[PDB]
Amino acid sequence: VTQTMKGLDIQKVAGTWYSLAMAASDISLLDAQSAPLRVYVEELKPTPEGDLEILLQKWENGECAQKKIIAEKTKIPAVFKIDALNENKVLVLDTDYKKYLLACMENSQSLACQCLVRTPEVDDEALEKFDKALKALPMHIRLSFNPTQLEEQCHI
């Protein structure tokens, strides 16, 4: 990923988001309801220090579970770290704060990206920006959700 948001203000991505679309480099990352990167964003909570708390849902061991993860800031405003055994990066590609946000997670390559939107509607303009960003990346699975699904736990 060589598309980052110039001039990102992380405080202004705060609040409610919907995972309208998702893509990944490997089918197995998004294939099943319980695939490892099939995660649905609920809320972004930037910290005063400029870290990013992410509230999401995931189908795990038979049901829809809530998880909270923190992505720590780096020297680059558009790039956060979630490290454990593995060094992983969260990248903000593009946002207008009020309607859409494009982001990817990548390892150290495998990756997964999402088109986030503020409301349970299909934003054709946001999806066209997402597809343009992906034309640069080696994606092998793409999913998108309808407005009914966007209002359900785990997009059921």
Add this chain to the structure above:
Amino acid sequence: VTQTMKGLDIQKVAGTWYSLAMAASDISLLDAQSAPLRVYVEELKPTPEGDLEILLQKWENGECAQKKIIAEKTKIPAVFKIDALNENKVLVLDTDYKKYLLACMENSQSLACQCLVRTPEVDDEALEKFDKALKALPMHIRLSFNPTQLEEQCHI
């Protein structure tokens, strides 16, 4: 689907094909390795009468199985019928016979389409034609395969 191949010669689609890409209206049709429309074309066998025999593979009850289905001709050269409990149509959107073929199956709507190619290579021109045909259709999952996967049973 309102894109059919004008002037189709069904005899000239005979022989070896590879399921390079697949798309469908509903995630659940293609999501799992064993999802109902996750089928890999091996061979097209037009009959002297102008019916279409389709040899394909599918992951069913734990393994990669061979199936043969016949799609019966209609009054329209680009449209075949596979009926059982349900009336389903196979539509040929576009082909150049020697490199790529675009086809969909639809019910009576849910649908699934494939980009078929003659060789285990990523044909960017065929994929751009597939994406152009899909921009007309309500697809929510898209998969594509690499050349290593294209040479394995059930694209493992």
